[PDB]
Amino acid sequence: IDLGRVIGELIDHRKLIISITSVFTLFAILYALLATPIYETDALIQIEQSAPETALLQSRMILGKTIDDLNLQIQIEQKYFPVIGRGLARLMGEKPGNIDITRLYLPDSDDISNNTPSIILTVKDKENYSINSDGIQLNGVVGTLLNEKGISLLVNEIDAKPGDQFVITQLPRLKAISDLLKSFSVADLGKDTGMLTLTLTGDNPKRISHILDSISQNYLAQNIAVRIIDNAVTDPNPVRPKKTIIIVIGVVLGLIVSVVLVLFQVFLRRGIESPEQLEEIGINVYASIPISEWDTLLAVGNPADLAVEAIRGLRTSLHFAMMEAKNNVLMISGASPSAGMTFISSNLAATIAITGKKVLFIDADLRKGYAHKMFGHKNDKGLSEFLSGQAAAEMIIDKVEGGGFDYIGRGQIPPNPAELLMHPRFEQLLNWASQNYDLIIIDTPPILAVTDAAIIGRYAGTCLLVARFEKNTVKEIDVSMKRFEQSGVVVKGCILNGVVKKASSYYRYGHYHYG
Amino acid sequence: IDLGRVIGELIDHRKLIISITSVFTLFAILYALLATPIYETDALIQIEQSAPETALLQSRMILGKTIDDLNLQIQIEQKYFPVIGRGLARLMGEKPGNIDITRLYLPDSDDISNNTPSIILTVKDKENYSINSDGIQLNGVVGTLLNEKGISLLVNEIDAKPGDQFVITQLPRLKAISDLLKSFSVADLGKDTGMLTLTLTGDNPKRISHILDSISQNYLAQNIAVRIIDNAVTDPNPVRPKKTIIIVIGVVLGLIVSVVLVLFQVFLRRGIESPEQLEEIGINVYASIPISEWDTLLAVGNPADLAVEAIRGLRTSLHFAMMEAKNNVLMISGASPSAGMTFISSNLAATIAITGKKVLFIDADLRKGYAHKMFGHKNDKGLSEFLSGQAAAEMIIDKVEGGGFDYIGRGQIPPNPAELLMHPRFEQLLNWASQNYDLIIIDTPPILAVTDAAIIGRYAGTCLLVARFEKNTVKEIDVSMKRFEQSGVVVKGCILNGVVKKASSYYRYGHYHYG
Amino acid sequence: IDLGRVIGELIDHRKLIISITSVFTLFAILYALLATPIYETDALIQIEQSAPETALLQSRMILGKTIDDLNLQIQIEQKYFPVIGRGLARLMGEKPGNIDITRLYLPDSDDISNNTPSIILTVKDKENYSINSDGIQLNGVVGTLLNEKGISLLVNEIDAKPGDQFVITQLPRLKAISDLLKSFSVADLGKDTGMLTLTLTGDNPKRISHILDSISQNYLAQNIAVRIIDNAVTDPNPVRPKKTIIIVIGVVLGLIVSVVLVLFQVFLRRGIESPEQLEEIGINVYASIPISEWDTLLAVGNPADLAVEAIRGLRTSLHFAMMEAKNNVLMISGASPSAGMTFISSNLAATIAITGKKVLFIDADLRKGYAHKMFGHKNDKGLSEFLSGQAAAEMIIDKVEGGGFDYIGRGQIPPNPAELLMHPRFEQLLNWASQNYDLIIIDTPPILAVTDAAIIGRYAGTCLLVARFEKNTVKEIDVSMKRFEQSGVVVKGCILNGVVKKASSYYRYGHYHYG
Numbered sequence A, B, C: 001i002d003l004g005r006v007i008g009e010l011i012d013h014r015k016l017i018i019s020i021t022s023v024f025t026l027f028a029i030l031y032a033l034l035a036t037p038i039y040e041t042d043a044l045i046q047i048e049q050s051a052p053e054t055a056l057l058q059s060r061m062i063l064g065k066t067i068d069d070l071n072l073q074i075q076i077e078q079k080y081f082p083v084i085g086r087g088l089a090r091l092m093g094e095k096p097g098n099i100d101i102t103r104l105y106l107p108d109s110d111d112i113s114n115n116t117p118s119i120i121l122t123v124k125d126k127e128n129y130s131i132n133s134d135g136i137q138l139n140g141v142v143g144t145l146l147n148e149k150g151i152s153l154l155v156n157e158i159d160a161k162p163g164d165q166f167v168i169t170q171l172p173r174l175k176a177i178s179d180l181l182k183s184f185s186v187a188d189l190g191k192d193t194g195m196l197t198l199t200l201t202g203d204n205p206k207r208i209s210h211i212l213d214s215i216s217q218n219y220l221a222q223n224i225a226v227r228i229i230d231n232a233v234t235d236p237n238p239v240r241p242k243k244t245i246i247i248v249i250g251v252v253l254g255l256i257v258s259v260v261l262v263l264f265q266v267f268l269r270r271g272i273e274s275p276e277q278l279e280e281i282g283i284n285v286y287a288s289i290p291i292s293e294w295d296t297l298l299a300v301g302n303p304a305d306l307a308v309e310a311i312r313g314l315r316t317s318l319h320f321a322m323m324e325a326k327n328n329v330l331m332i333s334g335a336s337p338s339a340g341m342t343f344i345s346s347n348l349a350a351t352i353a354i355t356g357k358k359v360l361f362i363d364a365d366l367r368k369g370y371a372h373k374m375f376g377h378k379n380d381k382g383l384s385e386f387l388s389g390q391a392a393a394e395m396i397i398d399k400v401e402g403g404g405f406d407y408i409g410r411g412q413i414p415p416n417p418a419e420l421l422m423h424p425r426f427e428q429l430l431n432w433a434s435q436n437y438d439l440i441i442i443d444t445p446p447i448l449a450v451t452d453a454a455i456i457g458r459y460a461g462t463c464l465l466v467a468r469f470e471k472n473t474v475k476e477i478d479v480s481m482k483r484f485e486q487s488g489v490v491v492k493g494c495i496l497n498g499v500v501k502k503a504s505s506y507y508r509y510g511h512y513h514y515g
């Protein structure tokens, strides 16, 4: 491989690359803007050692004392239903509410799993509130204590707007101690001095400084039954989430996944990409037809279409190839369905009719031929009725209205399509038509699916295959050619159909307007 | 190899891959949900050293003292018959039962192996219970002590539902001490401080905390004849089993075993996969017939089957190959049995009869021919009776009912099949039939097994081999061709039969419906 | 690749290389001259240890004491609207202003984000000033204190020119302490001695020395409730930005980006560069025409142009190639539009007419032919009107004025250009003209876009393609030749047009003046 190939591949897949990178970067931005910020407070302690003091600070006696002093076993969480409600509320500038609770005693359900009882408190005004544990609604008032239904509560100084809801949990003392220990750090910072740096993290910048001051006071008071050089203050800039590294990670991750996905698609492609793939195998390509982005004949509705220009190129190529052919019959076939055989056949018939030659178009697709719909029809008396013997050769020929050539439709779909085509009446029809017309074009079903084209091809002096631009593979076309050669039918060459513009190609068609 | 191959192989084997990975992941989930959880308790001790204290804590004097205090030599296990009964009971929310036993003395059988006597106690109510050691049933009551049959028991505070059974074992003191020592850990956690961290694991979160408190008290009391900073508490989250790592391991193990199994099957395949394998060796393939998923002729029951379409393709190929043949006799044979020789022969005869040609089908498989069953028969007077001389050429020919061609059945199975076929009456029959029919098709046994086809092939102007899609190998077909060539029989080519859709193939047949 | 190639590439791209390097170096110089200089002060302290003193110096008690003493919570910033205003003002020699403020109390808005209140003070004279916080304009006087609108201010010794504006911020004490800590360093410098080196950086060389003296005095005074060997002095040479390394980095970065960009363009080029690329494929090149940097015929306006000399070379080559041609008709075509087909065709006609031969020029580009504009026209009765039958062969021929040859214009643009050219009247016209002229030159549309040239080429004894020097590729020309060969038209060879001078080429044309 070379760099031009990969650059063209990136240019072609730019829509997917951009979409994937933008999606990943949007998710990264949403996380870096909706994650709750985490602040850090710290304090500095003087030791007159300092290895066992580190274990004494993190022990459950000191931390438990702090938790008892500060009532850290009463967890209060402002309620937002979604997982992004809190982040949005912070972004909108809404001030978070808080409640001071000095006494809480839940009935302590203490079942197998839920060791932490919790209730929901809804604020009705600055004074009263509603409480529900499991649907049991009670009304309480700030100030006066509540002792009802096995529930004790004392609420002071509700500072929020009415309608807010708060989850109040009474978690066990060990759970509180473990929570405090997880966010608490002690370090020496000199490895030999009596200086210890205590650190604490949390989402409330005032609460963490109060908690660290309590820890320092408890440790100092316990030791004298040590000097606090720096009492706890909180850095106002949150330490998490780290926004810029998150966004950079998101962008780079999006780019790498996009690149590997494009590499995956490029390594898994097998369709035809240029006429050179067919010409390596030894197959003549007579034209490349682009997709016309424009029940009508294209060569009649839009004669100045680019696909019709490419078909005029095919017309001039054929006028030279079909010299020294045994008769004036051309058969168009292909490997797979919806490659474009009917499109090519009918539009070629129209462009050859505009030059003043008499053209007969035969729809010999007895299984799915729709040419009568595309030309305007009297669907009675098609090729079926003629072959089965219930029609004559003069009742089946009709005129294309905006075209200028004659045609024969398929007729009624028969039960034995391949066997009807083997009747000698088919060759009688071809020999009769070959004397009243300058050209006969026969449209057929694909050869890999059924065998009708190989029957028809015995009486055609020229045979061309239609290959679809991206769908078909080189192996398909080669197998189709060999299946034709085995039945005694020589295939003159190929027509590539439905070509589109690709930056990776480096093959230049003339698929652009000139005028 | 290239990535497209391996991706196609994975697509083809996806059923096996998915099944294996799902089985392994289900087993991993069952283990991670049924393994008994193991909790951890820990405590913190202050040393005013700390290297020999680690050996003193783990010594048998202190641990034995703890065991004597807590009666850890009385093992009580709630009885579940299966190895998943306890896990299911925990999952169903059933509360485990417990019994407080303060005095236990089993008769101490003390045989060669079973040093641990054990009895089974069945709860009948909150007060009384039944006891059985070796079938000896006794009744006891909570409170009053039991001294009977050399068995002493004192049970207090049965807390369970009636019908529960408990195994009560009296294990030796050293066994209890070793059990305690296995789950007990001591560490320094500072490597120089007087701080020791004691840890204990077990399935009962309260029992382990009691045991660790007992150990700490015994060590402290013995030393003063040390400060306990943190008494034992249990982390409520079990430390084992670690569910997520178990499930991840199960998934990754399933994926790796699936991949190696698929790689094993791919490296061990030798059958034919595409007509290109036969065409490399120099063998013409005239058709590829798919499996028809539809005692009847397929070309008559379901004429619009895909296999019948492929056989019409073979019919058109043969109409061109059999030109310039010495006579109108076609022989179908093959390498191995049940490749499809009778299927191809009979369905080809039907599709050639629908085109209005007179066809004779001869079942020259004198060893296992069943064509008379498939056509509707008068089994008398087949080819056997004609060759052996006890029938004429006009009594053996019959009509296929839904077909449209004549046929000759095998007749009665003879004892000398190969020698009957060598009679000049066989060539007389063929020469007579060659003037009353347009085509004669002869179905034969496989050539690797027996030699009858090589005898028949002397009088056939065309001979084709049938290769089964996945069963046969290229070597088999080449050996069959060479065995035919050695006997003076030229094989025109091959028919691949029973082809199916494979994502790894990258060879495109036309085996899809068009209509 | 070899060194001559890369050197030629650099010579060719020197304009881009120089421009990019100069841009990057200009940006580096602008940064190294506009970044605010940062000075460094330092002091030396004697310790009679020195590990905990390092943590005591950087603690918030000592630094906070310094900030309280020096009023470092009053931030004063001289206001420049742009991000380069301060640098320009320093470069112009303008002396920065300063104000001594001893008392500041802002109303402390203290909203969600803006924790730092700030006001703007505009100097009106040496005595009075104007103050605005949020549009509230107040007048104050140096000396007398201001207590108005919840704002307290005391300003002393305004030393600046009138019209200056200063931002006065009251940042929080922790923010001031963090700012001081970020620019403050302590080191031991001997790792064992009682010598400590204190360092401080900042943009004001006097303020930082005062701050470091305050820190040293506070630490010394606190310890005695230590010897200061060196009091703080400031190095007069700024430590940042480091100009020379910045400029060197800019230059080297510019060079590397230029080199990679030129390498990118060289690896992405696919156009034709020399006639050897076409001659490898087997295509005869008959001339290489340079760009003429000079609605007129070039061979008439500037006959001594270099392009006309190259066209005289083509004339002599053609006089030898067109011997043994079937007729005296030459067709010029090409692959893509604006390759130069009309330029070559018309100028070749002029140079052949000056030698005394009778020349007919036919503009057979019925879609975009403009030759009538370039020759001076009576636009009526062109080739369209003749082919459609509404004009005779004697009314369509006109004289080029400054030329010397006859010509036929296209006529009115028809709706069916390709089909008009297929009329037998075209061959009648060519056969009639072939007897009254020595040479007929036909100009055509490009062959990849439309098919008209392949129709015209049947009646031309000689056909040449024009390839554009850098635009066309070898693949394009080869595809054009093969499209012509498929239609039965033999292409004699190619003309390379619009060649320019490239140092990387190492192919020498004769494109220089001789005279």
Ligand SMILES: Nc1ncnc2c1ncn2[C@@H]1O[C@H](COP(=O)(O)OP(=O)(O)O)[C@@H](O)[C@H]1O
Binding pocket: A289, A290, A291, A292, A293, A307, A334, A336, A337, A338, A339, A340, A341, A342, A343, A344, A497, A498, A499
């Ligand atoms: N180059 C093309 N540009 C635009 N439409 C096309 C082109 N080729 C085929 N088609 C349209 O795509 C559809 C499928 O092609 P069709 O010719 O009918 O398939 P088939 O090969 O089975 O005969 C048709 O509706 C056809 O008109």
Ligand SMILES: Nc1ncnc2c1ncn2[C@@H]1O[C@H](COP(=O)(O)OP(=O)(O)O)[C@@H](O)[C@H]1O
Binding pocket: B289, B290, B291, B292, B293, B307, B334, B336, B337, B338, B339, B340, B341, B342, B343, B344, B497, B498, B499
């Ligand atoms: N492509 C096929 N699709 C469906 N059934 C098939 C196909 N080929 C063979 N069979 C069936 O499989 C069985 C074995 O094949 P058969 O022709 O009787 O074997 P043999 O080669 O020994 O003569 C038969 O019952 C046949 O009808």
Ligand SMILES: Nc1ncnc2c1ncn2[C@@H]1O[C@H](COP(=O)(O)OP(=O)(O)O)[C@@H](O)[C@H]1O
Binding pocket: C289, C290, C291, C292, C293, C307, C334, C336, C337, C338, C339, C340, C341, C342, C343, C344, C497, C498, C499
């Ligand atoms: N070697 C050249 N030097 C200067 N001008 C040129 C040269 N070749 C072509 N041109 C001018 O560039 C323009 C495009 O070329 P033109 O011959 O008209 O294109 P086309 O190939 O489509 O017929 C014209 O205006 C032409 O005069």
Ligand SMILES: [Mg+2]
Binding pocket: A341, A342, A343, A365, A444
């Ligand atoms: Mg079709």
Ligand SMILES: [Mg+2]
Binding pocket: B341, B342, B343, B365, B444
């Ligand atoms: Mg059989």
Ligand SMILES: [Mg+2]
Binding pocket: C341, C342, C343, C365, C444
């Ligand atoms: Mg032009």
